[PDB]
């Protein structure tokens, strides 16, 4: 089964998931001088005021904060998107060291972590159907750097003790994902894929230009999670990121000059 270790990590995924070598794989390096400003891009519409968080789950690859996606409660619209995309979960990727951890890079720079707010296109009815469509998902990617603490992240940090190992979940209601957004919604956008098997090529990526800052203490608590289940040998959940993949026949567009 796949993971991020020496023998099951990203360089092995193509043997079970041949689309790993496909035409629109993610993440990618964002070359800021090669991205083209696109004035036809609309401003993003992030409508999270009615968000209903439910649960936080350690799934052995990351932790997911899950939302009620059975109604239009927390939705992403606008930008490059047509239609309405519902937030289903968010999760992070992070490093063993502050100098690595993000999946996307910016002029080859790696951030300490990266947040993925995952949304699916309501015209496909459910998430499982959406991932089979080229415009099925819209993921808001947000970089994390280490600096000052992020107050809106602390409620996540404080529950991680209760989901240390694979398969553990905890109630996680009344969490407001607006507290994880930077000030600016300037973004790059390109067509890509899930960054984790099955690597389906169903994602419109919207990657925010402005990182959020988290404290060293906050990211240290991410690194205390476990990939393993309870009663298995402890392997710290760190470096759960896929490296940049070839851009191939894609253009990254920028919402800003
Ligand atoms: C970020 C994320 C990624 C995936 C990828 C691993 C296939 N998956 C599994 C996607 C999937 C594949 N076939 C049906 N659903 C999910 C969850 C929400 C179900 C979340
Ligand atoms: Zn992700």
From Swiss-Prot:
Consequence recorded when altering residue 196 to H: Higher affinity for bicarbonate. Enhanced proton transfer capacity
Phosphoserine modification sites are 162, 169
Q: What is the effect of changing residue 195 to D/E?
A: Strongly reduced activity, but enhanced zinc affinity
Q: Describe what happens upon changing residue 62 to S.
A: 2-fold decrease in enzyme efficiency, as determined by kcat/KM ratio, and efficiently inhibited by chlorzolamide
Record: residues binding Zn(2+): 91, 93, 116
- Which Gene Ontology molecular-function terms are recorded? arylesterase activity; carbonate dehydratase activity; cyanamide hydratase activity; zinc ion binding
Give site residues, Fine-tunes the proton-transfer properties of H-64.
Answer: 4, 59, 64
The protein's UniProt keywords, in alphabetical order, are: Acetylation, Cell membrane, Cytoplasm, Disease variant, Lyase, Membrane, Metal-binding, Osteopetrosis, Phosphoprotein, Zinc
Q: Where in the cell is it found?
A: Cytoplasm; Cell membrane
Consequence of changing residue 59 to L = Reduced activity
> What pH-dependence text does the entry carry?
Optimum pH is 6-8.
Q: Which CDD domains match?
A: alpha_CA_I_II_III_XIII
Q: Where is the active site?
A: 61
Q: Name one Pfam family in it.
A: Carb_anhydrase
**Phenotypic consequence of residue 4 to F:** Enhanced activity
Upon changing residue 62 to F, the result is:
Reduced activity
Checking InterPro entries in the record gives: CA_dom (IPR001148), CA_dom_sf (IPR036398), Carbonic_anhydrase_a-class (IPR023561), Carbonic_anhydrase_a-class_CS (IPR018338)
> What cofactors does the UniProt entry give for this protein?
Zn(2+); Co(2+)
The reported result of mutating residue 198 to A is: Normal CO(2) hydrase activity, but impaired stability
Q: What is the effect of changing residue 118 to A/G/I/L/S?
A: Reduced CO(2) hydrase and p-nitrophenyl acetate esterase activities
**Effect ascribed to mutating residue 118 to K/R:** Strongly reduced CO(2) hydrase and p-nitrophenyl acetate esterase activities
For this protein, the activity regulation entry reads: Activated by X-ray, histamine, L-adrenaline, L- and D-phenylalanine, L- and D-histidine, L-His-OMe and beta-Ala-His (carnosine).
Q: Which disorder is it connected to?
A: Osteopetrosis, autosomal recessive 3: A rare genetic disease characterized by abnormally dense bone, due to defective resorption of immature bone. Osteopetrosis occurs in two forms: a severe autosomal recessive form occurring in utero, infancy, or childhood, and a benign autosomal dominant form occurring in adolescence or adulthood. Recessive osteopetrosis commonly manifests in early infancy with macrocephaly, feeding difficulties, evolving blindness and deafness, bone marrow failure, severe anemia, and hepatosplenomegaly.
Q: How does it assemble?
A: Interacts with SLC4A4. Interaction with SLC4A7 regulates SLC4A7 transporter activity. Interacts with SLC26A6 isoform 4 (via C-terminus cytoplasmic domain).
The molecule here is called: Carbonic anhydrase 2
The record lists the organism as: Homo sapiens
The uppermost taxa in this organism's lineage are: Eukaryota, Metazoa, Chordata, Craniata, Vertebrata
């Amino acid at each position: 089964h796949w993971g991020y270790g020496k023998h099951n990590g990203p360089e092995h995924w193509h043997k079970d998931f041949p689309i790993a070598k496909g035409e629109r794989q993610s993440p990618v390096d964002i070359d800021t001088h090669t991205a083209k400003y696109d004035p036809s891009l609309k401003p993003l519409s992030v409508s999270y005021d009615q968000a209903t968080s439910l649960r936080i789950l350690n799934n052995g690859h990351a932790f997911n904060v899950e939302f009620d996606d059975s109604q239009d409660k927390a939705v992403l619209k606008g930008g490059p998107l047509d239609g309405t995309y519902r937030l289903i979960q968010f999760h992070f990727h992070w490093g063993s060291l502050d100098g690595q951890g993000s999946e996307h890079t910016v002029d080859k720079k790696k951030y300490a972590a990266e947040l993925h707010l995952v949304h699916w296109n309501t015209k496909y009815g459910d998430f499982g159907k959406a991932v089979q469509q080229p415009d099925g998902l819209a993921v808001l990617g947000i970089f994390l750097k280490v600096g000052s603490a992020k107050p809106g992240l602390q409620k996540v940090v404080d529950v991680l003790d209760s989901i240390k190992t694979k398969g553990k979940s905890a109630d996680f209601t009344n969490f407001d994902p607006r507290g994880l957004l930077p000030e600016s919604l300037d973004y790059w956008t390109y067509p890509g894929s899930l960054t984790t098997p099955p690597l389906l090529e169903c994602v419109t990526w919207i990657v925010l230009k402005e990182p959020i800052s988290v404290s060293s203490e906050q990211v240290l608590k991410f690194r205390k999670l476990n990939f393993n289940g309870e009663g298995e040998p402890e392997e710290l959940m760190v470096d759960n990121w896929r490296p940049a993949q070839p851009l191939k026949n894609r253009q990254i567009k920028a919402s800003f000059k």
